[PDB]
Structures are given as C-alpha cells and as structure tokens.
Amino acid sequence: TKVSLVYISLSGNTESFVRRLTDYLLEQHPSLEVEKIHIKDLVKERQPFFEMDNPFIAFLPTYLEGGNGVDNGDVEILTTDVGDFIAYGQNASKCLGVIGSGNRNFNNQYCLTAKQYSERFGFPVLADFEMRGMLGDIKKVAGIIEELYHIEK
C-alpha cells in the first residue's frame, strides 16, 4: 500500500505540515510508502498533469480574493492548479478527500476553499488545521490516513 499526499504551499505552512505528517507516519510505520506531490513544483518545472494510479488526499491552504470581490470575496486565488490537477482525467474519483489549512481570523471564510472543492468533486473535507498545524492535528490526520489506507495500528 502507498500513501499519496497531493498539496500546494505558497508560504510554507502546508509544506511544513506535510513534512511533519510524513515523519510521524514513518515513525509509526517504518515500512510505509509515502509519496508527496507538490503541485507548485509540477507547475514551476513546467511538467504536465497526469492521472493518479493510487488513491490520494489533497491538502489545500485557503486563499480568497476577499475585499469587495464578487460573491462576498469567496473567489479562490493562487491555489487553482490543485483544482485543475484533481479535475484532470479521473483524478476526482481517486481523491479520498481534502484537508484544509487556514487562519481562524478569517472567521466564516476559514478553510472555505476545501469545502468548495468538496462540494464540486463530491469527496469529503477530512479535516482542517490552522497555519502550520499542531501535534494534535498531525496525530488526527495520521489516524484518518491509517483508516483510509487500512494501515495496521
């Protein structure tokens, strides 16, 4: 069994979480295969999108136009390449769910993009965390991953 973590990180918060989550998973399951796919790196290095051969979890930080933007400023910015990757071929049917990263000071817009992705593609929001996330978030997401990939505890 292989764990696939598809993410984007613009200021490093989600990148940090994915790194620490992977370290935690390997500490608990030394032989586990964990694949990280950074969408930003695929785009910048001018690599094409592809179809996943393995079920995966999406990690999506929240960036919205805000201000006096159309539809209460709830238009996604900067992260749309993640949506494109999921919308590619049959990737949506391969997505186990989305995990949102955000800032509680954004009140009702806290992790809104994850819910938008969930509503569009039909997979659930598995969890949300604030900024880099805490140990409690690491452990929770690790548990969800163990359940979803049927990993022995």
Annotated binding site for FMN: 9-11, 13-14, 62-63, 103, 109, 111
Residues 151, 37, 7: CA angle, nearest 5 degrees: 90
Cα(151)–Cα(138) distance, rounded to whole angstroms? 16
What CA–CA distance (Å, rounded) separates 25 from 104? 27
Query: x/- site string to ligand FMN, residues 26 to 65, per CB under 6 A?
Result: -----------------------------------xxxx-
At 131, which helix (H) or strand (E)?
Answer: none
| Binding track over 59-98 against ligand FMN, x by CB under 6 A | --xxxx----------------------------------
The HSE-up count of residue 14 (CA atoms within 13 Å, CB side) is 28
- Provide the minimum distance between the beta carbon of 62 and ligand FMN in the complex, in angstroms, as a whole number: 4
14 makes contact with ligand FMN (CB under 6 A): yes
Whole-angstrom distance, CA of residue 126 vs CA of residue 6: 14
Is 118 one of the binding residues for ligand FMN (CB under 6 A)? no
Lay out the site mask for ligand FMN across 120-149 (x = CB under 6 A, - = otherwise).
-----------x------------------
Give the full edge-to-edge strand order of the sheet including 95-102. 33-38, 2-7, 56-61, 95-102, 125-130
Which residues lie near ligand FMN (CB under 6 A)?
A: 9-15, 61-64, 101-103, 106, 109-112, 131
